[PDB]
């Protein structure tokens, strides 16, 4: 059994948390 | 810059609130209360929060003359300070005395 769309959406919520922290780190590295 | 004090008056320490000036202070009118304090002490802002004023001459820009006259009655009823003078600042930089108009 493969992975449905709801768990891919949960992985995208987790990646959004990761993307926010990457977006904060890259800008404060740019200072 | 746009809210520069007259020479002789120093700014009280306030951390900035959201209740202060709006676009009317840029385009129509704003107001300025200038008083003299003998020490550094803590007064409630008329727009929310608390500020600390220093010994000497302190000036504060407000959106509204009733905000200034409420600040003035707070200084009288708490700190016995009666030399507040209230100016109306126009956006070109003109300053006129509107309390005490008698002197």
């Amino acid at each position: 059994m493969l992975i449905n769309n709801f768990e891919v959406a949960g992985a995208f919520v987790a990646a959004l948390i990761a993307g926010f922290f990457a977006l904060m780190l890259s800008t404060t590295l740019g200072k | 810059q746009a809210n520069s004090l007259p020479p002789g008056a120093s700014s009280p320490i306030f951390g900035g609130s959201t209740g202060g000036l709006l676009r009317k202070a840029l385009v129509e009118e704003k107001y300025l209360i200038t008083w003299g304090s003998k020490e550094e002490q803590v007064f409630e802002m008329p727009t929310g929060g608390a500020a600390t004023m220093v010994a000497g001459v302190n000036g504060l820009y407000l959106a509204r003359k009733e905000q200034c006259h409420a600040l003035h009655r707070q200084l009288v009823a708490k700190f016995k300070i009666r030399d507040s003078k209230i100016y109306r600042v126009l956006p070109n930089g003109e300053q006129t005395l509107i309390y005490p108009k008698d002197g």
Partner: protein, 154 residues
């Protein structure tokens, strides 16, 4: 340190939502604030983004949407009705911008009444075009969302 004010008398706060440099880069290079742009192009880009997204709720959620309706023959009426709906919403926004313009704006943009009318005009063309472009990509989402070359012969 994070919440400062610069001008402590103006009723505003310098906060990481306000004062971090990537949001200031995003907002100051969103079209209405992007430097070196005529108001017409600004309204055009705002219109294209808006009119592209405005097609979507009308075609998924509107009165012509179901799988219980009549073939996908109703789907072309759905795309056409959603396209007209997004254009008339852009027309109402154009009416809003140009009634704002024609009574004589006072605002922090340095647009005149003529500048906001350039914005209104760009808004209308960009919005109707964004509606039309979203409708064309919605018509083309059959071959877009699969490998079209492969089921077709020759």
């Amino acid at each position: 340190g994070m919440v400062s004010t610069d001008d402590f008398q103006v009723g505003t706060l310098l906060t990481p939502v306000n004062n971090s440099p990537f949001i200031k880069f995003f907002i100051n290079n969103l079209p209405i604030n992007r430097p070196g742009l005529d108001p017409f192009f600004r309204g055009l880009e705002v219109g294209m983004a808006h009119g592209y997204w405005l097609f979507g709720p009308f075609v998924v959620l509107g009165p012509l949407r179901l799988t219980a309706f009549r073939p996908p023959d109703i789907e072309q009426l759905s795309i056409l009705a959603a396209l007209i709906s997004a254009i008339v919403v852009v027309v109402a926004g154009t009416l809003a911008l140009s009634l704002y313009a024609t009574v004589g704006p006072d605002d922090d943009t340095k647009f005149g009444a003529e500048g906001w009318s350039r914005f209104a005009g760009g808004w209308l063309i960009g919005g109707g075009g964004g509606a039309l472009f979203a409708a064309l990509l919605y018509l083309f989402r059959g071959p877009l969302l699969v490998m079209l070359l492969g089921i077709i012969p020759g």
